[PDB]
């Protein structure tokens, strides 16, 4: 009925995908009642820079909730390291990074 928010991307998670294909990048989210405002950012060195005006959605499958970043389609430059983030109470929660490998 009540729990803390978790953005539980596992450490060293990666995906490799064909350029020109659609892709759905998943942020597994644990929440209990009050669905968090999850955002995506892409790593530029030390900084995780928030992604603006991107297509996002929510997915639920076998009692797991995912926040999705859509790539329609993947481009070569989409290569890199991504994190999901959310405010919970007065905390900023940040997931481990997930790495994308695009085959050009």
């Amino acid at each position, epitope marked *: 009925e009540s729990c803390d928010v978790q953005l539980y991307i596992k450490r060293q998670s990666e995906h490799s995908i064909l350029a020109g294909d659609p892709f759905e990048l998943e942020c597994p989210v644990k929440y209990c*009642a009050n*669905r968090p*405002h*999850v955002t995506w950012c892409k790593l530029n060195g030390t900084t995780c820079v928030k992604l603006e005006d991107r297509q996002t*959605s*929510w*997915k*639920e499958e076998k009692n797991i909730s995912f926040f999705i970043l859509h790539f329609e389609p993947v481009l070569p430059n989409d290569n890199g390291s991504y994190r999901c983030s*959310a*405010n919970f109470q007065s905390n900023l929660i940040e997931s481990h990074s997930t790495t994308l490998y695009v085959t050009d």
Partner: antibody, heavy 121, light 111 residues
Framework: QVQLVQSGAEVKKPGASVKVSCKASGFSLWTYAMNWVRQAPGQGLEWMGIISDDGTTYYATWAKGRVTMTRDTSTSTVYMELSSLRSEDTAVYYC???????????????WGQGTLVTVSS | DIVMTQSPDSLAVSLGERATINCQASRNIYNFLAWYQQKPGQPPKLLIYSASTLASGVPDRFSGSGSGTDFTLTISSLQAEDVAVYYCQQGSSNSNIDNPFGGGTKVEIKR
């Protein structure tokens, strides 16, 4: 308890703007996002957009460039401004508390009483 | 865009009989689907969220089912106070969408 109290009925001429307010009681604008929804007389519910925990706004396609959603977190008040009013904007404008913190609307758990805006010569 | 379609437009059921109304999404919205009841001159009231969870205080004659793109609200035995307009609403995305609400279904007593 938790309440939403909206500003009073407005009467507007074609071409005017309107700014409707919605004062929230008993929760923070950082906990639950606010949605704006309108309804023309005898018609369906039309979602206009959502203002998130951190103030980020997302709008229905038709509402982009017409609707501006703002907030003042010190009073827990949210605002909906609609520009270049036309007779077909005549509607009851509702604020509604989201179950969630924003980004994507989740579902709506609490409604304001609505504000009638009549646009006419 | 995710287009939400309700059917039928209106439904007439005799007092005490079963009322079933449909909501369809143009693309997969999983279980991010809520149902509302609205009476004349009132704001909508939430009945069901996550496709099938009854909101606090809602009579258990109300039930929701479905997942993906096909959803139903069922009133097992229609009562006078159930005469209303019912809306479904998707909570999966708002990326370039027109309306997360369906167009509504009017439920009336058949006599």
């Amino acid at each position: 308890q938790v309440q939403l109290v909206q500003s009073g009925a407005e009467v507007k001429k074609p071409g005017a703007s309107v700014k409707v307010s919605c004062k929230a009681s008993g929760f923070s604008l950082w906990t639950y996002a606010m949605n704006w929804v309108r309804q023309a007389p005898g018609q369906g519910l039309e979602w206009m957009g959502i203002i998130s925990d951190d103030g980020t706004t997302y709008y229905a396609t038709w509402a982009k460039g017409r609707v501006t959603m703002t907030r003042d977190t010190s009073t827990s008040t949210v605002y909906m401004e609609l520009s270049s009013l036309r007779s077909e904007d005549t509607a009851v404008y509702y604020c509604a508390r989201d179950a969630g913190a924003g980004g994507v609307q989740d579902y709506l758990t609490l409604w304001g009483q609505g504000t009638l805006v009549t646009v006419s010569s | 865009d995710i287009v939400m379609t309700q059917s039928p437009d209106s439904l007439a059921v005799s007092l005490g009989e079963r009322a079933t109304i449909n909501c369809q999404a143009s693309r997969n919205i999983y279980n991010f689907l809520a149902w509302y009841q609205q009476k004349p001159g009132q704001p909508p009231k939430l009945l069901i969220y996550s496709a099938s969870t009854l909101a606090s205080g809602v009579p258990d004659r109300f039930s929701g089912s479905g997942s993906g793109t096909d959803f139903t609200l069922t009133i097992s035995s229609l009562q006078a106070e159930d005469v209303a307009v019912y809306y479904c609403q998707q909570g999966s995305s708002n990326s370039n969408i027109d309306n997360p609400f369906g167009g509504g279904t009017k439920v009336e007593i058949k006599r």
